[PDB]
Amino acid sequence: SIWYGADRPKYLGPFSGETPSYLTGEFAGDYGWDTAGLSSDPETFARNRELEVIHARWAMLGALGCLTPELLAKSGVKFGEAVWFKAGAQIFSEGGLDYLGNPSLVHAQSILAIWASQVVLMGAVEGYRVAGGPLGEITDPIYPGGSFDPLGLADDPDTFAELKVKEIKNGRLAMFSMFGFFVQAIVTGKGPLENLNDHLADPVANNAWAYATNFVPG
Amino acid sequence: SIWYGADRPKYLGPFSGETPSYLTGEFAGDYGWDTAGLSSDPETFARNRELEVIHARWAMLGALGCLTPELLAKSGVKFGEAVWFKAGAQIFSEGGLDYLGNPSLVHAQSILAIWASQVVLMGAVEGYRVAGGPLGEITDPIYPGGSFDPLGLADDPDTFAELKVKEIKNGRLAMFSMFGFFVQAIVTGKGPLENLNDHLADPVANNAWAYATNFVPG
Amino acid sequence: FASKQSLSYLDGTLPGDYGFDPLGLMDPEGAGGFIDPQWLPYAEIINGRFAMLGAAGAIAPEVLGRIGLIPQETAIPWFQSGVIPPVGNYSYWADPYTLFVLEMALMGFAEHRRAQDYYKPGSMGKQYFLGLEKFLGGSGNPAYPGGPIFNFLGFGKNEKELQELKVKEVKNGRLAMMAVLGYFTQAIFTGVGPFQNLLDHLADPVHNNVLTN
Numbered sequence: 001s002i003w004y005g006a007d008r009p010k011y012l013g014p015f016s017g018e019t020p021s022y023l024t025g026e027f028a029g030d031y032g033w034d035t036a037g038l039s040s041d042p043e044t045f046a047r048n049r050e051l052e053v054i055h056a057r058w059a060m061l062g063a064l065g066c067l068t069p070e071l072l073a074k075s076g077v078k079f080g081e082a083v084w085f086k087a088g089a090q091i092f093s094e095g096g097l098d099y100l101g102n103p104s105l106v107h108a109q110s111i112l113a114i115w116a117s118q119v120v121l122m123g124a125v126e127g128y129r130v131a132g133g134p135l136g137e138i139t140d141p142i143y144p145g146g147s148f149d150p151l152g153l154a155d156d157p158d159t160f161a162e163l164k165v166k167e168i169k170n171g172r173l174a175m176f177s178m179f180g181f182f183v184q185a186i187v188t189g190k191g192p193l194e195n196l197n198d199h200l201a202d203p204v205a206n207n208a209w210a211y212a213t214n215f216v217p218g
Numbered sequence: 219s220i221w222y223g224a225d226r227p228k229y230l231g232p233f234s235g236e237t238p239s240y241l242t243g244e245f246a247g248d249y250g251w252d253t254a255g256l257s258s259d260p261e262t263f264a265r266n267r268e269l270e271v272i273h274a275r276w277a278m279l280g281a282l283g284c285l286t287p288e289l290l291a292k293s294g295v296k297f298g299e300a301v302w303f304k305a306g307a308q309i310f311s312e313g314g315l316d317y318l319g320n321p322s323l324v325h326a327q328s329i330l331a332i333w334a335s336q337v338v339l340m341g342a343v344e345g346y347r348v349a350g351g352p353l354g355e356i357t358d359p360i361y362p363g364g365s366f367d368p369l370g371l372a373d374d375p376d377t378f379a380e381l382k383v384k385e386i387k388n389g390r391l392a393m394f395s396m397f398g399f400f401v402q403a404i405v406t407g408k409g410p411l412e413n414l415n416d417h418l419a420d421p422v423a424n425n426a427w428a429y430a431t432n433f434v435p436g
Numbered sequence: 437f438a439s440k441q442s443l444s445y446l447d448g449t450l451p452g453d454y455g456f457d458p459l460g461l462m463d464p465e466g467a468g469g470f471i472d473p474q475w476l477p478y479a480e481i482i483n484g485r486f487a488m489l490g491a492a493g494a495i496a497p498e499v500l501g502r503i504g505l506i507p508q509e510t511a512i513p514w515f516q517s518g519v520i521p522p523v524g525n526y527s528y529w530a531d532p533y534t535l536f537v538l539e540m541a542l543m544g545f546a547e548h549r550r551a552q553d554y555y556k557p558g559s560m561g562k563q564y565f566l567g568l569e570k571f572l573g574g575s576g577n578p579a580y581p582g583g584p585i586f587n588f589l590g591f592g593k594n595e596k597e598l599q600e601l602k603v604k605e606v607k608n609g610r611l612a613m614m615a616v617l618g619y620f621t622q623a624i625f626t627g628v629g630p631f632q633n634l635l636d637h638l639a640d641p642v643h644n645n646v647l648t649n
């Protein structure tokens with residue numbers, strides 16, 4: 001339990017120095033990084049913790065879903081459109097949006113129906129997340145357990161803490177990756193796999209400096 | 219004195235109005251301007267102190283480094299790109315980083331090597347700042363002193379306080395000047411010297427509001 | 437010492453000790469089973485000893501062809517001698533598989549005797565063979581054995597001289613291992629021998645960085 005103890009590796013490595021007074025551990029992914037001083041209030045700290053974990057889970061899902069179709073298309077899978085920031089336009093295409101390019105799957109043709117279904121279902125599930133519903137009741141805002149851990153991988157509290165650290169670390173990495181995806185898609189104009197393939201060959205000029213001159217005023 | 223006593227200049231002048239309880243005297247050049255209450259928490263307020271100090275020092279250095287090259291270019295020495303936001307093409311030109319127009323000086327040719335060099339150097343530098351180092355042990359993050367005041371000009375507490383007040387106000391002036399520089403670059407697309415030259419000639423004709431007509435969407 | 441701080445797991449007593457172990461693999465919590473106090477230094481020094489010969493022989497044919505006292509048919513690239521047949525091949529009196537089997541059998545004999553001596557100090561000193569038990573005496577530690585044939589020169593009279601020599605050996609091993617790693621990196625990037633890379637930085641100092649390809 002190196003992370004949870006009063007001596008943890010911190011975000012500077014061995015040469016860390018000052019650690020915030022309130023950050024005594026007791027939380028997954030505690031690296032003593034509060035340079036902005038935003039979570040000084042305890043309730044604000046709890047709200048920011050909730051935001052962090054929800055964002056981490058959403059970003060892990062987003063990174064997986066932004067990488068998988070592109071990797072499949074590169075590997076040889078047929079798609080109507082595979083670029084992560086272009087996949088939304090398939091609903092406005094004549095062929096329609098078909099899962100894995102198969103007309104026998106989903107075969108969605110209207111955007112309004114998708115929007116209405118998403119609004120209704122996500123409203124229901126977020127209301128459940130805030131007030132408890134069919135899958136259980138609110139015990140901890142972030143870690144409900146029970147029906148959402150059916151296999152019981154977090155029965156042991158020590159293993160529970162270790163899994164918390166693992167999940168938060170993977171999630172923060174995924175969040176950083178999603179920010180990278182957004183900025184690279186708006187700068188280069190090609191998918192993450194295209195950028196990686198460009199960096200694979202001739203990395204000297206396949207970087208941000210190549211496009212550093214595209215936003216000069218004039 | 220005036221800065222530290224109740225008789226403060228304040229930010230509005232005649233309209234002192236209501237003043238925050240924690241922002242009433244006993245601080246470096248406080249004017250009571252907290253209309254959004256960001257720094258109510260003492261920790262938060264301290265963190266804002268160091269953030270403001272560091273942004274101010276870097277703003278001073280950046281403003282000086284942006285002002286000097288164009289002034290020297292107008293002096294007469296050859297400059298490939300004295301414009302502050304055009305310095306990127308210096309490494310993208312074939313001649314390279316000719317310091318003061320001399321190929322016999324610096325004369326860089328690549329960006330990866332120098333960028334990595336600094337990333338390592340400044341990481342070590344900032345790490346030393348936050349967590350001490352062989353140079354010295356920091357007694358307060360905002361104003362360490364010692365090696366960085368080797369002459370001890372501010373040994374007297376009164377001149378130390380006055381110099382700190384001057385440093386804060388000049389740092390805020392550097393803030394505002396850098397913001398002006400950025401907006402000038404985005405809107406007008408030219409350096410500050412061209413802007414001041416244009417404002418000198420026919421001030422009514424050369425106005426900021428001639429560039430407001432092209433911001434219409436469509 | 438050693439840039440990053442040490443954790444007293446090693447005090448410098450071991451031959452060739454410097455302390456640059458930021459992770460600390462011999463940490464008892466992180467050490468066990470395969471990890472043995474005797475085994476890791478032995479493995480390090482053997483990888484270094486073979487790196488000596490590897491670094492020397494990756495250039496010996498090319499430098500000998502350069503000076504001009506070896507047949508020019510031996511100027512083949514080090515990767516074309518038969519280590520990786522897909523890249524190329526070099527002429528020989530027998531097939532590469534035959535010499536491979538020969539060398540594997542002989543190295544099997546030698547390695548087996550060495551491993552027996554490491555496991556049991558009496559190997560080839562009290563075993564059964566045609567009079568080589570008395571000619572393969574096990575002396576001192578297994579990693580630094582010596583013997584009637586090993587100590588023919590007799591060098592290393594004083595313990596201070598021994599420690600000096602051994603720290604020199606480990607330093608040379610480390611530099612040779614880094615050199616050989618650079619050998620693979622240059623081979624996989626430029627596709628040429630390291631000697632030609634020397635010829636290039638000597639000829640064109642600004643020839644290239646990495647590969648630019």
Ligand SMILES: CC(/C=C/C=C(C)/C=C/[C@@]12O[C@]1(C)C[C@@H](O)CC2(C)C)=C\C=C\C=C(C)\C=C\C=C(C)\C=C\[C@@]12O[C@]1(C)C[C@@H](O)CC2(C)C
Nearest residue numbers: 456457458459460483486487490493494514519613616617
């Ligand atoms: C043995 C070796 C090379 C041997 C080469 C041989 C025999 C070559 C033979 C031939 O080529 C010739 C001559 C030419 C032809 O005939 C073909 C063959 C036949 C192919 C290299 C070893 C090379 C060994 C290497 C590179 C070892 C690197 C180790 C590192 C970096 C360790 C780092 C750390 O462990 C520390 C020190 C401390 C920890 O806390 C942290 C970390 C970071 C984990």
Ligand SMILES: CC1=C[C@H](O)CC(C)(C)[C@H]1/C=C/C(C)=C/C=C/C(C)=C/C=C/C=C(C)/C=C/C=C(C)/C=C/C1=C(C)C[C@H](O)CC1(C)C
Nearest residue numbers: 033034035036037058059062065066084087175176178179
């Ligand atoms: C720590 C700290 C401390 C102190 O206080 C200082 C400071 C600085 C303040 C801090 C920091 C912070 C940070 C770093 C942050 C970050 C953030 C992020 C990055 C986010 C993201 C975030 C992100 C996210 C969510 C994302 C998401 C995503 C998604 C869903 C996606 C989706 C999709 C897909 C799949 C596919 C398709 O085709 C498209 C779409 C539909 C689109």
Ligand SMILES: CC1=C[C@H](O)CC(C)(C)[C@H]1/C=C/C(C)=C/C=C/C(C)=C/C=C/C=C(C)/C=C/C=C(C)/C=C/C1=C(C)C[C@H](O)CC1(C)C
Nearest residue numbers: 251252253254273276277280283284302303305393396397
């Ligand atoms: C106080 C208060 C109070 C109440 O309460 C209200 C509120 C709101 C809360 C608050 C406010 C605030 C504000 C206003 C702020 C601002 C800021 C800024 C402006 C900054 C800058 C800032 C700025 C800065 C740092 C800057 C920096 C810079 C640098 C480094 C560099 C530069 C450069 C150079 C040299 C050269 C090249 O070629 C270019 C460049 C690259 C460009």
Ligand SMILES: CCCCCCCCCCCCO[C@H]1O[C@H](CO)[C@@H](O[C@H]2O[C@H](CO)[C@@H](O)[C@H](O)[C@H]2O)[C@H](O)[C@H]1O
Nearest residue numbers: 124125127128129130131132133134135136137138147
């Ligand atoms: C065409 C429409 C047909 C009817 C479908 C829609 C009906 C309206 C939805 C009502 C949902 C009410 O749900 C609310 O009360 C339920 C009990 O009744 C709770 O549900 C709880 O009890 C149910 C049965 O008693 C169990 O099956 C659930 O596992 C349990 O969580 C939910 O936690 C709560 O969110």
